[PDB]
């Protein structure tokens, strides 16, 4: 039937759920186009998974993503992490892996973080983060 795959990406507190449906080469983010949803200087941090791979490999793929929670850079890190898994899951499931293996190896040699998440959270303590109160005379 219809060709589709579902992926999700996570960050510290930013969740980015993605729907990959066989389409015609259309990319839209959070409703907004790719021109808008990012800070102005970090919009570059969105195009690398596309430019490193080539636009010719996005012939019949459509992606719709909803992201929430966290901060601006958490959201952009969630979407950049979600795109790699969406494309590799669609190619692995629906087409020959001759593309998939070269996509995966070339992308991970450029950056390993596309497939694995970075675990970092905060630690509670009874004086603040890691520093205590001032002491009188040592």
């Amino acid at each position: 039937s219809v060709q589709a795959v579902q992926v999700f990406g996570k960050k510290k507190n930013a969740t980015a759920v993605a729907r990959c449906v066989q389409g015609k080469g259309l990319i839209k983010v959070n409703g907004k186009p790719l021109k808008l949803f990012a800070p102005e200087i970090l919009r570059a941090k969105l195009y690398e998974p596309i430019l490193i791979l080539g636009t010719d490999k996005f012939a019949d793929v459509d992606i719709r993503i909803r992201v929430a929670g966290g901060g601006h850079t958490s959201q952009v890190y969630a979407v950049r992490q979600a795109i790699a898994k969406s494309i590799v899951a669609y190619y692995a499931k629906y087409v020959d892996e001759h593309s998939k293996n070269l996509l995966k190896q070339e992308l991970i040699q450029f950056d390993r973080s596309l497939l694995v998440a970075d675990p970092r959270r905060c630690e509670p303590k009874k004086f603040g983060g890691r520093g205590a109160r001032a002491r009188f005379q040592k």
Partner: protein, 199 residues
């Protein structure tokens, strides 16, 4: 369509920074390689790396973000990489216009020339100093060179009509050659001179 027309010019060629290339790297000396990492190009400096877990993880790391990190100090400028990345990129744009060479072409020679080769060590002598005048490792040399350039820019731009956008830019071109009128050289010559005296 899906890509901007600006980046479409460079996407056909090999991957590089949009404004400037990473080819034609300096041939000037040795013993400073293997600690400056340029084999993997990066578009924007900003990156959430894992370089602060082991000892020498910072040796394999792009230089540009390290400069951005050292550029932000003195309490107020904590966490503002959005501001820092634009300022550093503009500084490379400013330095590009005074010299046809690549901004990284000038920047690498700037770092490689402003690194001290000797330093004085503190050995206790019951109130006196037995300064042995030890040498400096290359990694500490580049680490301190970055600090000198950043504190020089911050001190110069402090309480001055100039702005940090070109205030940072002017040291890189000044330090590219042996001008001797920069803050980094002011600290550098004093350190070798005191080591020379205290040998």
């Amino acid at each position: 369509d899906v890509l901007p027309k600006e980046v479409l010019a460079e996407v056909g060629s090999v991957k590089l920074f949009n404004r400037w290339s990473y080819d034609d790297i300096e041939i000037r000396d040795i013993s400073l390689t293997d600690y400056i990492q340029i084999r993997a190009p990066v578009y924007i400096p900003h990156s959430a790396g894992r370089y602060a877990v082991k000892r020498f993880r910072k040796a394999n790391c792009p230089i540009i973000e390290r400069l951005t990190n050292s550029l932000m100090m003195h309490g107020r400028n904590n966490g503002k990489k959005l501001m820092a990345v634009r300022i550093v990129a503009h500084a490379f744009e400013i330095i590009h216009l005074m010299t046809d060479q690549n901004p990284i072409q000038v920047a690498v020679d700037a770092i490689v020339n402003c690194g001290p080769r000797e330093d004085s060590t503190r050995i206790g002598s019951a109130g006196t100093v037995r300064r042995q005048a030890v040498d400096v490792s290359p990694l500490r040399r580049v680490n301190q060179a970055i600090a000198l350039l950043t504190t020089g820019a911050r001190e110069a731009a402090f309480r001055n009509v100039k702005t940090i956008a070109e205030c940072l830019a002017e040291e890189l071109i000044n330090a590219a050659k042996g001008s001797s009128n920069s803050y980094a050289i002011k600290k550098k010559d004093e350190l070798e001179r005191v080591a020379k005296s205290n040998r």
